[PDB]
Amino acid sequence: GKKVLIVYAHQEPKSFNGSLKNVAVDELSRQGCTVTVSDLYAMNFEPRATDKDITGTLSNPEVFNYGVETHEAYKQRSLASDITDEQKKVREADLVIFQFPLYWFSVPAILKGWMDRVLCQGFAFDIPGFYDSGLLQGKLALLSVTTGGTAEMYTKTGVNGDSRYFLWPLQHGTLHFCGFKVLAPQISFAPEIASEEERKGMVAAWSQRLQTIWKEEPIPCTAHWHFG
Amino acid sequence: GKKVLIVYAHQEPKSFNGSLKNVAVDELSRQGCTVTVSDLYAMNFEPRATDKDITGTLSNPEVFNYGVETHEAYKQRSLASDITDEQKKVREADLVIFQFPLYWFSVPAILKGWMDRVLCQGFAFDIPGFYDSGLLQGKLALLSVTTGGTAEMYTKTGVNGDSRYFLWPLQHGTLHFCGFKVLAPQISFAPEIASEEERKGMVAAWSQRLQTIWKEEPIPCTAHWHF
Ligand SMILES: Cc1cc2nc3c(=O)[nH]c(=O)nc-3n(C[C@H](O)[C@H](O)[C@H](O)COP(=O)(O)OP(=O)(O)OC[C@H]3O[C@@H](n4cnc5c(N)ncnc54)[C@H](O)[C@@H]3O)c2cc1C
Ligand SMILES: COc1ccc2c([nH]1)c(CCNC(=O)c1ccco1)c1c3ncccc3cn21
Ligand SMILES: COc1ccc2c([nH]1)c(CCNC(=O)c1ccco1)c1c3ncccc3cn21
Ligand SMILES: [Zn+2]
Ligand SMILES: [Zn+2]
């Protein structure tokens, strides 16, 4: 038995991202997995890192440091409840899937906000207790990303450079840093340009991959893998 | 003369980021430059890309495509006023400085939101106006970043890898894509672990660099430079 959290960042239920999220839910549910989705836009998830995220007495009310105060709030259990709700989902998950369209070679701001606010010191990592020693060790993570650009544009000699280049801050800087084992990304290239057959094919490829996801090994999340 | 926009993303006026923004204002003002600051947290800037970003009626009320809708809204002068207020500042700017603490090898979400919502198709880029032909061509941009990790950690064989690795999506994927000439990043490594005078020294070096900012040539914003 396994628990899966899908963190989902798209405004439109009928979108290609919506479909990839839905097929994930369908297929994991079919397998008998326990599945939770955080639909960030539907939740109106707060992306801003602010002093509203701590409810108790601040450690240093004279000079607000978000990282310091949230670390302390985590230990004290005085974080805002929207944060702790997400932390509970992550804590219990065996696999966390991020489903999102690429926005400026990265995640949409609403999802960046989830990373900034949910993955606080004490919960996701400590010093020491990061990268291979991160607090979310044992967990798997996977980026399921859609793009405007074609596969050709995301090559070493394409205009955008290789797709692995933009994965670095997310796979290494974030997921690996927290101790996740990172599974190979699912990149669904240019669904807007693609034909009806091609789009249905990309959806089916994701569904098919998920059939055997529990048998996958993670990538070596290193500079070499990303950059060569 | 010259116009500068500083897009600033820190919660605390007394912060090291706050000090860097303040000396940028001081020095550029001293030079006679026109200076505007977008203090995102003070503005409670909206980071989320939503249908509220379009006023009046949507291009397609049945299926919402943020990219299409905002492109059309830009052309039809129907974007939300927070977005258009920022676009005006950007349009008029000769130099855009981003001042922020590194969050997860990237910009804080509030600043990511500024990028997502302000830099829409038709304004910041289109086909074929991208990279070298981007619609903001002729403008300069500069990332002024502070880190928690020390300089040593950001070496190519350090735990975090080279600083240039995380700069790719921001400098190339975003700034260069919009046509910006990208000035060398100002990176202030690990201010929190002091010292008082080392902190004073980093602030001072930023101020000093700003003295001859208009003399600078942009970096070659390429895969080779970063990797
Ligand atoms: C969500 C989140 C994600 C993060 N991700 C990363 C990451 O991926 N990689 C990474 O390396 N780091 C990361 N960090 C750490 C973060 O980048 C640093 O905490 C931040 O850069 C420090 O800058 P600051 O302005 O907040 O420092 P401050 O704490 O504000 O400054 C340090 C000290 O300088 C003092 N000071 C202010 N002005 C002056 C002055 N003029 N002269 C002398 N002293 C002065 C202040 O009083 C303070 O005591 C993350 C932090 C958070 C909260
Ligand atoms: C403050 O609160 C926070 C919150 C989140 C952080 C964070 N600090 C740091 C910096 C951690 N300290 C140090 O390396 C340090 C302290 C002294 C010398 O080096 C980092 C990251 N560094 C790399 C990759 C992802 C990171 C997320 N985060
Ligand atoms: C309006 O919707 C948007 C908003 C912002 C975008 C965007 N599309 C695209 C994809 C642009 N299309 C194509 O490559 C393309 C070619 C042929 C058909 O499509 C990109 C980016 N691509 C690379 C780097 C940054 C980017 C920012 N943005
Ligand atoms: Zn890694
Ligand atoms: Zn470039």
From Swiss-Prot, chain A:
Role of this protein: The enzyme apparently serves as a quinone reductase in connection with conjugation reactions of hydroquinones involved in detoxification pathways as well as in biosynthetic processes such as the vitamin K-dependent gamma-carboxylation of glutamate residues in prothrombin synthesis.
Effect of N160H: Loss of activity toward CB1954, no effect toward menadione
Cofactor requirement: Zn(2+); FAD
Annotated residues for binding of Zn(2+): H172, H176, C221
GO cellular component terms attached to this protein's record: cytosol; extracellular exosome; nucleoplasm
Note in the entry: Uses dihydronicotinamide riboside (NRH) rather than NAD(P)H as an electron donor.
One Gene Ontology term of the molecular function aspect: electron transfer activity
Biological process terms in GO annotation: quinone catabolic process
Binding site for FAD: 10, 16-19, 102-105, 146-149, 154, 192, 199
Predominant location category: cytoplasm
Keyword field contains Calcium: no
Transmembrane annotation, as ranges: none
Cofactor, how bound (note): Binds 1 zinc ion per subunit.
Enzyme class: oxidoreductase
Catalyzed chemical reaction(s): 1-(beta-D-ribofuranosyl)-1,4-dihydronicotinamide + a quinone + H(+) = beta-nicotinamide D-riboside + a quinol
Domain of life assignment: Eukaryota
Modified residues (Phosphoserine): S78, S195
Enzyme Commission no: 1.10.5.1
Regulation: Inhibited by melatonin, resveratrol and 5-hydroxytryptamine.
Keywords on record: Cytoplasm, FAD, Flavoprotein, Metal-binding, Oxidoreductase, Phosphoprotein, Zinc
Name assigned to this protein: Ribosyldihydronicotinamide dehydrogenase [quinone]
Localization terms from the record: Cytoplasm
